[PDB]
Amino acid sequence: MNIFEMLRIDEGLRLKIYKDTEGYYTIGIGHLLTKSPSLNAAKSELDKAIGRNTNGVITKDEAEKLFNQDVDAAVRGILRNAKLKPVYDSLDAVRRAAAINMVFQMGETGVAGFTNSLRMLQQKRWDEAAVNLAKSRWYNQTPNRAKRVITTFRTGTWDAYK
Ligand SMILES: CSc1ccc([N+](=O)[O-])cc1
Numbered sequence: 001m002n003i004f005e006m007l008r009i010d011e012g013l014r015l016k017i018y019k020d021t022e023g024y025y026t027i028g029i030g031h032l033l034t035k036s037p038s039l040n041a042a043k044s045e046l047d048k049a050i051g052r053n054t055n056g057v058i059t060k061d062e063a064e065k066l067f068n069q070d071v072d073a074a075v076r077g078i079l080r081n082a083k084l085k086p087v088y089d090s091l092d093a094v095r096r097a098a099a100i101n102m103v104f105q106m107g108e109t110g111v112a113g114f115t116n117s118l119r120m121l122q123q124k125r126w127d128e129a130a131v132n133l134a135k136s137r138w139y140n141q142t143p144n145r146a147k148r149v150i151t152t153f154r155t156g157t158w159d160a161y162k
Contacts, residue, residue, distance in 0.1 A: 001158035003071055003097040007104055009161055010145050013063060017042055017056045021142055028063030030104065031070055074103045081108055083115070087122045095121070098152040105145070106138060121153065130154040 011030030017039070020026040025033045025042035033045040046054050050062055078084045078099065088099055102111055114136070120129035130150050133139065139146040151160035 001161050003100050004067070006097055006101060006152075006158075006161055007067070007071065010101065010105075010148070013060070015058055015060065015063060017046065027058060027066075029067040029070075031063070031066045070104065071100065074100050077108055078103055083118070084108070084111070087118045090122050090124075092156055094156045094158060095153055098149050101149050101152075102138075105142075110138075126154050126156075 008029055013029050014027065017025055017027050017033070020030065020032065024035050025039065025045075027033060027046055031049070033042040033049075036042065043054075043056050046056065046058070049066060050058060078088050084099070084103070088096060091099065102114075114133070117129055117132045120132055130153060133150050133153065134146065136146075139150075148160035152158070
């Protein structure tokens, strides 16, 4: 297991434009295209991302290329964020993957309300962190995925993904 395999499980792979759990146009391995309700706007974003006229369909190699870029950018963003860097740097590699997973799903703004969870994680209060993480819109809207990510933070193992 690693962040790539973990997100591939949580996000799936679809080669045609689809709507994510929030109803937003997406492609590949959970690559958010736009929050615009315009399918034409999403198609434009897709074309821009891939560098060709895709007509709303991409290949597996193309999906994987976007995915690698997205994981990389998620990490680089974390390292540039004064609220996230300290916690990320304090974590072991397995729990780092859990952090990247959350940022990938919700974005940095999406994780702004997690200040108290973040402190518990930095403190290595794992069971307490796990309890606090579940007190969230995230947990309620995507409970199965949230439970896997939370288990990963609680245990520092890949048990939830085996
Ligand atoms: C509870 S959300 C979150 C976001 C980032 C990190 N991080 O260590 O970069 C951890 C948790």
